[PDB]
Design an enzyme around this catalytic site. Structure first.
Site, PDB file in Angstrom:
ATOM      1  N   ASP A  55       6.860 -11.237  -7.432  1.00  0.00           N
ATOM      2  CA  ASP A  55       6.965 -11.029  -5.999  1.00  0.00           C
ATOM      3  C   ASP A  55       5.732 -11.300  -5.138  1.00  0.00           C
ATOM      4  OD1 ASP A  55       8.538 -10.110  -3.631  1.00  0.00           O
ATOM      5  OD2 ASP A  55       7.025  -8.516  -3.656  1.00  0.00           O
ATOM      6  N   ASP A  58       1.577  -8.606  -7.530  1.00  0.00           N
ATOM      7  CA  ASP A  58       1.978  -7.787  -8.667  1.00  0.00           C
ATOM      8  C   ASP A  58       2.811  -8.610  -9.647  1.00  0.00           C
ATOM      9  OD1 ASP A  58       4.218  -8.106  -7.060  1.00  0.00           O
ATOM     10  OD2 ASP A  58       4.826  -6.011  -7.145  1.00  0.00           O
ATOM     11  N   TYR A 206      11.368  -2.523  -1.559  1.00  0.00           N
ATOM     12  CA  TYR A 206      12.250  -3.386  -0.802  1.00  0.00           C
ATOM     13  C   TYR A 206      13.576  -2.698  -0.510  1.00  0.00           C
ATOM     14  CZ  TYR A 206       9.017  -7.305  -1.376  1.00  0.00           C
ATOM     15  OH  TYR A 206       7.860  -7.996  -1.243  1.00  0.00           O
ATOM     16  N   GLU A 424      -2.555  -9.084   1.802  1.00  0.00           N
ATOM     17  CA  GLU A 424      -1.386  -9.126   0.940  1.00  0.00           C
ATOM     18  C   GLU A 424      -0.806 -10.536   0.978  1.00  0.00           C
ATOM     19  OE1 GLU A 424       0.128  -7.878  -1.432  1.00  0.00           O
ATOM     20  OE2 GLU A 424       2.182  -7.229  -1.044  1.00  0.00           O
TER      21      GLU A 424
END
Ligand SMILES: [Ca+2]
Ligand SMILES: [Ca+2]
Length: 605
Positions: A55, A58, A206, A424
């Site tokens: 994703d 990670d 999510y 991120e």
């Protein structure tokens, strides 16, 4: 001409997706710092669930955003095949789409069963290290009639349906397989209704905030395009009336944007483009107006620098997603004022991300002027001590990744790997962005780099042995050896290591009298010494069975203290492995490390 090289940016965006791959990598792998990983995915349920994309920074394989990413990339390729053809990136787009779709096929063992997650968010996020040496267990999760997931199933159906159109001309057989899967998945989603996050542990990451209504309209439309079956378009236009309204009025949502959660906004435009009905045009217009000129005094927050800041998380991702759809819409609408307004908004937002901002810096890793260097990404960082803080700089360049960027409308940003807001990175972050780039390449052009990717070279010895004299002596030599595995090109396991220390037998020393002992040894302590030839002998330390990997302070190393006692007559000055060993721990080039019998470090006599 192009204010920024859109073709190069797209070229690098495609490399980013290749860097996010899980499973066994191909021979043609372009990312030299990536190796096989997640090889036992699906084992817990007797299935092969290897492959797919990680994703973000990670290693969890989140099916909801992964599918959305696929649908967005396919959409861009459908809208602007020329952008991808001109940038020379079409084959890479197809390679990326085939990678993710091959996984969706694996994850769909039977019509009403879809595996939507591999890996546990909490266990995964507790460890900071390269994907190739993950030490934790990775559970498989799924949705079925017993515990459905209309949102994720419909999204995966849309991803496969949209992708089939891209492969139609190249691989008609594959395209057919995708459509067949998409049909089954959509029926499953339409028949067994429920929010997937109520069934799988993805709520903290999510969560399906919007629900599934939007995915039902979105999936139906894409299936219509892939099949040509009118019933689907009918289905889309029917479900459309149940889309979320806003607060107190009957106006459909216009204050957010399309992303992995809510596809409402995309359907506004897609249906307007398809049917031409004023109903869709009105909704699409309201939304895009809120992002540009504002509606009823209300407008998305703008930074002085000119960035549209919707929220703290993935601010740039949101602006980029809107920019892509605005470009698609700008082509269908007839109003010259709106066409210009939306088109110019899109270009302004993408350009901001590419460098046209108060900081004069790119927000795309490895691209343009003063790009981010430390994105929040485990494998790109290459830590060998389970620490987000070391080493200081990421060991690899994650070319193409769009970072979160400024979370507030003030254009402020600091390149800090520990800032999971600003730094991120994620597969969905690059989805709308890539599609926008494809459109821009078609319109403004640009040229890809002839020699890309660059081949990175290690920042030092990856697997080696450090040594130093532990206790000085005359009738013996006591060495303190340290085996280190700080690999990163790619990170790899060393579970069959042994090393040899050669020495020359001296006058008056009986080899039968030589003893090897230790007061601390994480590996085995040998009883004998081995004779090579003449008076050349060696001591072999056996560490097989020890898992030495770059995944922690204790995991990446093994300490071995060993004393070779030969009695009076012992003379280390003519010993091969003794060369260069001092009182400080440093690499010992004359101690050879073997990986299952194959030399990996040092030089033998
Ligand atoms: Ca939704
Ligand atoms: Ca000697």
């Amino acid at each position: 001409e192009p204010a920024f090289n859109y073709a190069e940016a797209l070229q690098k965006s495609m490399f980013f997706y290749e860097a996010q791959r899980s499973g066994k990598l191909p021979e043609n792998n372009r990312v030299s710092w990536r190796g096989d990983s997640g090889l036992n995915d699906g084992a817990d349920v007797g299935l092969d669930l290897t492959g797919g994309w990680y994703d973000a920074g990670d290693h969890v394989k989140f099916g909801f955003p992964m599918a959305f990413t696929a649908t967005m990339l396919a959409w861009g390729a459908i809208e602007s095949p020329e952008g991808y053809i001109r940038s020379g990136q079409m084959p890479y787009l197809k390679d990326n789409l085939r990678w993710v779709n091959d996984y969706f096929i694996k994850a769909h063992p039977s019509p009403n069963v879809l595996y939507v997650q591999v890996g546990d968010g909490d266990a995964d996020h507790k460890w900071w290290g390269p994907a190739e040496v993950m030490p934790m267990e990775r559970p498989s999760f799924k949705v079925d009639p017993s515990c459905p997931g209309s949102d994720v199933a419909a999204e995966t159906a849309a991803a496969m349906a949209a992708s089939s159109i891209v492969f139609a001309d190249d691989d008609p057989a594959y395209a057919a397989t995708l459509v067949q899967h998409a049909k089954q998945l959509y029926t499953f989603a339409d028949t067994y209704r429920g929010v997937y996050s109520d069934c799988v542990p993805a709520g903290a990451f999510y969560n399906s905030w919007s629900g599934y209504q939007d995915e039902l309209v979105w999936g139906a439309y894409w299936l219509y395009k892939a099949t040509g079956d009118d019933s689907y378009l009918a289905k889309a236009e029917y479900e459309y009336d149940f889309l979320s309204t806003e607060q107190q009025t009957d106006l459909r949502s216009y204050r957010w944007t399309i992303a992995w959660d809510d596809k409402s906004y995309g359907t506004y435009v897609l249906l307007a483009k398809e049917t031409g009905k004023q109903k869709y045009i009105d909704d699409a217009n309201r939304w895009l107006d809120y992002w540009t000129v504002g509606v009823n005094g209300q407008r998305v927050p703008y930074s002085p620098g000119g960035m549209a800041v919707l929220d703290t998380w993935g601010a740039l991702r949101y602006a980029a997603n809107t920019a892509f759809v605005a470009l698609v819409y700008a082509k269908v609408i007839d109003d010259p004022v709106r066409k210009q307004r939306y088109h110019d908004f899109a270009v302004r937002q993408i350009n901001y991300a590419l460098g046209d901002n108060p900081r004069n810096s790119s927000y795309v890793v490895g691209f343009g002027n003063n790009p981010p260097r430390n994105p929040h990404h485990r494998t790109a960082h290459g830590s060998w001590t389970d620490s987000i803080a070391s080493p200081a700089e990421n060991r690899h360049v994650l070319y193409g990744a769009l970072v979160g960027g400024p979370g507030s409308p003030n254009d402020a940003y600091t390149d800090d790997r520990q800032d999971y807001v600003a730094n991120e990175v994620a597969t969905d972050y690059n989805a709308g962005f890539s599609s926008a780039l494809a459109m821009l390449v078609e319109e403004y052009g640009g040229t890809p780099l002839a020699d890309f990717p660059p081949t990175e070279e290690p920042d030092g010895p990856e697997i080696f042995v450090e040594a130093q004299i532990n206790t000085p002596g005359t009738t013996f030599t006591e060495i303190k050896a340290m085996i280190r595995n700080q690999s990163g090109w790619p990170a790899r396991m060393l579970d069959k290591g042994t090393f040899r220390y050669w020495f020359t037998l001296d006058e008056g020393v009986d080899p039968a009298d030589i003893t090897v002992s230790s007061a601390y040894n994480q590996c085995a302590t040998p009883e004998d010494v081995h004779h090579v030839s003449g008076d050349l002998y060696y001591v072999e330390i056996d560490c097989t069975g020890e898992k030495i990997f770059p995944g922690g302070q204790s995991e990446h190393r093994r300490e071995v203290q060993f004393r070779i006692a030969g009695g009076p007559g012992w003379d280390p000055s003519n010993d091969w492995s003794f060369q260069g060993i001092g009182n400080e721990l440093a690499p010992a080039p004359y101690i050879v490390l073997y990986d299952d019998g194959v030399p990996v470090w040092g030089t033998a006599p």
